[PDB]
Amino acid sequence: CQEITVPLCKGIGYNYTYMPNQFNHDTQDEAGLEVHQFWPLVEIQCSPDLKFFLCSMYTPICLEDYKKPLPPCRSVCERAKAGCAPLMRQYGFAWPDRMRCDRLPEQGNPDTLCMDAA
Amino acid sequence: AWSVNNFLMTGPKAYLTYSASVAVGAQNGIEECKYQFAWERWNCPESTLQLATHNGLRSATRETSFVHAISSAGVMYTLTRNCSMGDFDNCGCDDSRNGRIGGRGWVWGGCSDNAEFGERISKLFVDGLETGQDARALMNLHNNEAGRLAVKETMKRTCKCHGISGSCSIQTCWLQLAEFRDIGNHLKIKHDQALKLEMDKRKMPSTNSVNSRRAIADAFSSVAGSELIFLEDSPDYCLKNISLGLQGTEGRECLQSGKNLSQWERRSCKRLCTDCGLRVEEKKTEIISSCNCKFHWCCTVKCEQCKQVVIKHFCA
Amino acid sequence: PLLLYANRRDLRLVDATVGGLEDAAAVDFVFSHGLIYWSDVSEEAIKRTEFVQNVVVSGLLSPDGLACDWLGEKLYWTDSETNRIEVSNLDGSLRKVLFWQELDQPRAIALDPSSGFMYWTDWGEVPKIERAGMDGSSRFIIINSEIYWPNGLTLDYEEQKLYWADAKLNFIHKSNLDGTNRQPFALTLFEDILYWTDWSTHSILACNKYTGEGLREIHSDIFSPMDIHAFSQQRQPNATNPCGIDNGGCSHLCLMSPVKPFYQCACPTGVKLLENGKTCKDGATELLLLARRTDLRRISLDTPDFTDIVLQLEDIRHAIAIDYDPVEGYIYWTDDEVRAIRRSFIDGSGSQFVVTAQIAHPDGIAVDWVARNLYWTDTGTDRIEVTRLNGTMRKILISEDLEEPRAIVLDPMVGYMYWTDWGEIPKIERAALDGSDRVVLVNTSLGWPNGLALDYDEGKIYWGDAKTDKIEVMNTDGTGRRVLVEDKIPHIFGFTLLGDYVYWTDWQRRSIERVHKRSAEREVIIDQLPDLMGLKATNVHRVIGSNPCAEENGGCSHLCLYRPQGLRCACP
C-alpha cells in the first residue's frame, strides 16, 4: 500500500493505493500525470462516477484486510462512460480502451468482487 | 570494488555472497520441475543438495537432462534478476541498445535485465560444480547450457505506452524475463521428449584410457543446444528402486474428479495408481474457498469464506 | 620524494603537491642506470624500460614480488601461483629458480645487496615473512607469529630495519630480522614519512616514519594501489662489487653471498658445476623427453629438482612418442595429429621432418644408433617400416602376420629386434634386425601389450600390458618371466629404463612414476602433467658399443641390418 498523492484522487473513497497500478505505473505521481489529462472532463463534471472510476483504475484501492485488487464495478464504468462519453466522442475523445467496461467484473458475484453502491 | 581486475585480493573473491541467490535460483528451478511433473509417475523427486551430490540422479535417464537444464535456467534467471534489480546497483542493467528507435512509434529504454551477467555467474558456479570428464558430464553440461539459453531465448520485449492520454502511439520498451511458468512448461516438454544418447555397443577399446576415451564423448556432443541430453533409458517409475533415489508410486496424490482437470491429470489416477497395480484410497475432509463476500459500500472490502469438497486419490 | 605506484593499467609518479597494460602487479628501478622493471600478473611476465623491454617472460603464473639488485646486477622474483622464486641476470639471461619447495603463494620479494640477503612473504595458510641468501642459501622463516594477509615488506638500509603492513589487521609493523615494532598492502619510505596504501580507503595515508604521528593524507582517489616505492638515487647506497672486474671468474652467474668472498659462482638451470667450482659443465648432460598431447618437454635426471623446461616448438597437436639419438644428437618424436615424425635438438632448433607419408597410427618408432638406421611401427597400417636417420630409404620391413603393432625396440650389438603386437593375438616377438627369424617370445596371459623395454646390459626385456595392467620382466631369450608390478596402465604410456630405475606413466597419463628396477622403491618423478604418452631415458653423451655395421654402414647401400649370425643389407 501507498498513500494517495494525486490531487484529483484525494478523498475519492480510499486513502491507500498500491503500485504498480492497472495502467502499469511506477509511482503515484506517474499515475497522476496520466489521469490529469482528463482534468477538463473532470471540471465539466460530465459524470459523478468518472472521478471515482478513473481513480480506482489509475491508483486502485489498497486495503490492509483485503489484499486482492478491488476494481470499480462494471455499472460505475458504464455510467461514467454513458454520461461523459457523448461529449468526448463529439469532440473526438473515445472512451479509453483500458477503461473499457466489459473488461471489469460485474456486481453481484462473490468471485467477481468490485466497488460500487449496493 | 565488486567489479575489479580480480587478480590478487577482493576481486578474485565474491563467490560466497552470491551462493545464496544461486541456490534460490536452482530451488525455483527444482520447484518448477516438480510443478511440470506434478501428476506424472516421475514427479521431480530431487533436492537442491542432490544436484551437487549427484546422488539420486546418476541415471542418465530422460528426466535428469531436464532437471539439469531447469536448474541451470533457474540459477541464471534468479541471479540475472538480482543483478538487474538494484540489490546489486541494478548493474546499470542492459544499457546497450537503450534509447534507440526499434520500430515505428516505439523506442528502446527501461532497465532491461542484464541476462549476460546472470549467465556469467551461473556458468561460473554451476559448471564448476559439474565435476568429471565422462560422457554423462558432457550430457549434463549440454542440458545445463540448454536451460541457460532456454531462459535467455525466452526473454521478451515488454513495453509501456506513454503516448497522449495513454495511447500506445508512442511507447517505451525494454527487454524483460518471461514468466517462469513458460520455462517450466518448456522444460516439461523437454522432459517428456528427452532422448537417450549414443548407447554404443562397440565402444573403442578403453581398458587403458590414455589414448582411448577423450574422443568418444567428443563425437557424442552434436546435440541441440536447446535440447537436453541423456544417455541411459529412463527407469520404470511405477517401481521403487532405493539405489536410484526413486521412492515408488505408492502413496502419491492423483487427480480423479475435477471440474477443469487436464486429461493427463484426470487420467493421472489410473496412470500412477491403477496402471501401477495399487488401489485408490480417499480423504474424508474437504477444503474451503472464500465465498459470501460483501464489499461494503466505499473504502472497505470484506469477504466471507465458503467450504467445498476437493478430489484426489491415493495409490494405497 | 617521488612516489611510484603500480596502478593496474598504468605506472606513474607522484611528487609532493607508461600506459596500456593489463594488470600490473610489481615495479622496481635501478636509479643509477635509469631503469624501471615491472611485473604483470595477468600477462605472466616481467618487463623493463629505461628512464619497453622483456626481462622475465619464460613462464610465470602469478608473479607478485620483483626487486632489482643494483650491486650484483640481478633480478629476483616470486610467482604466487606456481609457488616458486627465480633469479636471473639484469637483462633476463642465465635465469635460475632459487626456490620452489615449501612455497604456498609467494607474493612480494625484496633483496638487500649490501647485506646480501633477499626477503619475501608467503600468503598461504601459514603466512610468513622469510629471508634467504641472495643465492638461495638457507631459506629462513623470520616472522610466523600473528600475521594474516601480510604485505608491504620494507627494509630500512639507513637504519637496518625491516617494516611491513597487514592488509587484514590494519597495522604497519617494523623489525629487522628479529625485534619487531608495530607502528594496508605495500609500503615504502622516503625521508621522515612512512606512506601506506589502505585496502579499504583507496588513498595514500601518510605518517611519520619514526614516530607515526601525523596520519596525513598524501593523495586521494587512488583506487588500485598494489605497490609503492621511493624512486630515488639516495634509495640505493653505493658499494663495490665483490665479483669485481668480471663476475669474479664465474663463468656464468656471480651472485651476492653473505659469507666467504661475498660472491658465489653459479650455473644456469640443469647444468652441473665441475670440480673446479668455477667452470660449469657444457649444459645438462641428460634428457628425459616427454611427449604430451600438445607440448614436448625435457627433464634433466642429474639433479633432484626435475624442472620441465618447455621446448619452444610450434604446431604440436597430438604427440605420442619421443626419443633421442645421442650419436648425432637428434631428437625424433611423433605426432598423431600431424601424422608425422619430427627431429630437433635439446634446444628445439634445427627442427626438421623425418617422415610425412603413409602413416596412420604410428604406435612404434625405433632409432638404430650403431648402423644409423631408423625403424618404426604403425598400428594403423599394421607394418614396421625402416629408413635411415636422414629419413630416406624408407622400407617396409615387416607387414605380414602383425596386427596392431605398438612398441618396437632393437639390440644392435646382438642383432635382435623385439616388438609387441595386439590385434587377433597379442604377443611379444623377437627377430633379427632384418625381419628374419620372426619368433614369438611370450604368448599367453597377454591382452593389450602397450610397452617394451630392453635391458641391453643384462640380456633382459621388459613389457607392460594395457589390458592386464601388469609390467613383466623376462630374459631376452631363456625365459625368466616375472610380473614386476601390478598397477593401472595408461593406453599411451611413457615408459623408459636407464640405470637402476624404470620410468612409466600412471593410468590417467598425468604423472610419471619410477620403480628401482633392482629393488622395489617407487618414487613419483613428475606429477600434475596430463596427457603423457611416451618416454625415452637416454645419455646424451655416452655411446655404448659397436657392430660391423658401424664401419661404412657394413657395406650396405641403404639399410645395414645386423643378425647374430651375421648381417643383411636391405632396400627401400
Short mmCIF file of N, CA and C in Angstrom, two decimals, chain A residues 9-51:
data_model
loop_
_atom_site.label_atom_id
_atom_site.label_comp_id
_atom_site.label_asym_id
_atom_site.label_seq_id
_atom_site.Cartn_x
_atom_site.Cartn_y
_atom_site.Cartn_z
N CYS A 9 -7.57 12.51 -6.78
CA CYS A 9 -7.99 11.26 -6.17
C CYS A 9 -7.92 11.30 -4.66
N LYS A 10 -7.54 12.43 -4.08
CA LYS A 10 -7.54 12.52 -2.63
C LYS A 10 -9.00 12.55 -2.20
N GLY A 11 -9.33 11.75 -1.19
CA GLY A 11 -10.70 11.74 -0.69
C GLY A 11 -11.67 11.30 -1.76
N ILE A 12 -11.28 10.31 -2.57
CA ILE A 12 -12.16 9.73 -3.57
C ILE A 12 -12.96 8.57 -2.99
N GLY A 13 -12.48 7.96 -1.92
CA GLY A 13 -13.12 6.83 -1.28
C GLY A 13 -12.14 6.06 -0.43
N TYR A 14 -10.86 6.08 -0.81
CA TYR A 14 -9.84 5.37 -0.07
C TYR A 14 -8.57 6.20 -0.05
N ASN A 15 -7.79 6.04 1.02
CA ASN A 15 -6.57 6.82 1.20
C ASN A 15 -5.33 6.00 0.90
N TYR A 16 -5.49 4.72 0.58
CA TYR A 16 -4.39 3.80 0.40
C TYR A 16 -4.48 3.19 -0.99
N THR A 17 -3.39 3.26 -1.74
CA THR A 17 -3.33 2.68 -3.07
C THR A 17 -2.05 1.87 -3.19
N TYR A 18 -2.01 1.01 -4.20
CA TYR A 18 -0.85 0.18 -4.44
C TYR A 18 -0.17 0.59 -5.74
N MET A 19 1.04 0.07 -5.93
CA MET A 19 1.78 0.27 -7.16
C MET A 19 2.53 -1.01 -7.49
N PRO A 20 2.66 -1.34 -8.78
CA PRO A 20 2.14 -0.59 -9.94
C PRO A 20 0.63 -0.75 -10.06
N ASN A 21 -0.02 0.10 -10.84
CA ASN A 21 -1.46 0.10 -10.96
C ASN A 21 -1.90 -0.66 -12.21
N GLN A 22 -3.22 -0.66 -12.44
CA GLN A 22 -3.79 -1.30 -13.63
C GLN A 22 -3.20 -0.73 -14.91
N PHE A 23 -2.63 0.47 -14.86
CA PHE A 23 -2.02 1.11 -16.01
C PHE A 23 -0.52 0.89 -16.06
N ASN A 24 0.03 0.13 -15.11
CA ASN A 24 1.45 -0.18 -15.02
C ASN A 24 2.27 1.11 -14.86
N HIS A 25 2.07 1.73 -13.70
CA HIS A 25 2.76 2.95 -13.32
C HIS A 25 3.69 2.67 -12.15
N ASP A 26 4.86 3.29 -12.16
CA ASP A 26 5.82 3.10 -11.08
C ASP A 26 5.34 3.79 -9.81
N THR A 27 5.24 5.11 -9.86
CA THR A 27 4.88 5.94 -8.73
C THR A 27 3.46 6.46 -8.89
N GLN A 28 2.90 6.95 -7.78
CA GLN A 28 1.60 7.60 -7.84
C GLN A 28 1.66 8.87 -8.69
N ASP A 29 2.80 9.55 -8.67
CA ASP A 29 2.97 10.75 -9.49
C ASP A 29 2.83 10.41 -10.97
N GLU A 30 3.36 9.26 -11.38
CA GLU A 30 3.21 8.82 -12.77
C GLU A 30 1.75 8.55 -13.11
N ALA A 31 0.98 7.96 -12.19
CA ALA A 31 -0.42 7.72 -12.49
C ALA A 31 -1.20 9.03 -12.52
N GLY A 32 -0.78 10.00 -11.70
CA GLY A 32 -1.47 11.27 -11.66
C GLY A 32 -1.21 12.06 -12.93
N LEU A 33 0.03 12.00 -13.43
CA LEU A 33 0.38 12.67 -14.68
C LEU A 33 -0.53 12.23 -15.82
N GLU A 34 -1.00 10.99 -15.77
CA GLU A 34 -1.85 10.43 -16.81
C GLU A 34 -3.32 10.74 -16.56
N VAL A 35 -3.77 10.62 -15.31
CA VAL A 35 -5.17 10.90 -15.02
C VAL A 35 -5.47 12.40 -15.11
N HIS A 36 -4.44 13.25 -15.03
CA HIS A 36 -4.62 14.69 -15.16
C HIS A 36 -5.03 15.11 -16.56
N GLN A 37 -4.78 14.28 -17.57
CA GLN A 37 -5.20 14.62 -18.92
C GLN A 37 -6.72 14.61 -19.07
N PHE A 38 -7.43 14.17 -18.04
CA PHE A 38 -8.89 14.16 -18.04
C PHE A 38 -9.45 15.35 -17.29
N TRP A 39 -8.57 16.14 -16.66
CA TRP A 39 -8.99 17.27 -15.85
C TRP A 39 -10.05 18.14 -16.52
N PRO A 40 -9.96 18.49 -17.81
CA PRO A 40 -11.09 19.20 -18.44
C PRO A 40 -12.40 18.47 -18.20
N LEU A 41 -12.44 17.20 -18.61
CA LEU A 41 -13.66 16.42 -18.49
C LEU A 41 -14.10 16.29 -17.04
N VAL A 42 -13.15 16.39 -16.11
CA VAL A 42 -13.46 16.36 -14.68
C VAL A 42 -14.13 17.66 -14.25
N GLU A 43 -13.57 18.79 -14.68
CA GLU A 43 -14.12 20.09 -14.33
C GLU A 43 -15.52 20.26 -14.89
N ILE A 44 -15.73 19.81 -16.13
CA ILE A 44 -17.07 19.82 -16.69
C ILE A 44 -18.02 19.03 -15.80
N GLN A 45 -17.51 18.02 -15.09
CA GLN A 45 -18.32 17.12 -14.27
C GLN A 45 -19.41 16.47 -15.12
N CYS A 46 -18.99 15.87 -16.23
CA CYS A 46 -19.90 15.15 -17.10
C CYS A 46 -20.47 13.89 -16.47
N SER A 47 -19.78 13.31 -15.48
CA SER A 47 -20.35 12.20 -14.74
C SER A 47 -19.80 12.18 -13.32
N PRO A 48 -20.65 12.00 -12.31
CA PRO A 48 -20.12 11.96 -10.94
C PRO A 48 -19.19 10.79 -10.73
N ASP A 49 -19.42 9.68 -11.43
CA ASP A 49 -18.65 8.46 -11.21
C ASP A 49 -17.28 8.53 -11.85
N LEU A 50 -17.12 9.37 -12.88
CA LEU A 50 -15.89 9.38 -13.67
C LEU A 50 -14.65 9.51 -12.79
N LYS A 51 -14.69 10.41 -11.81
CA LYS A 51 -13.54 10.61 -10.94
C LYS A 51 -13.25 9.37 -10.11
#
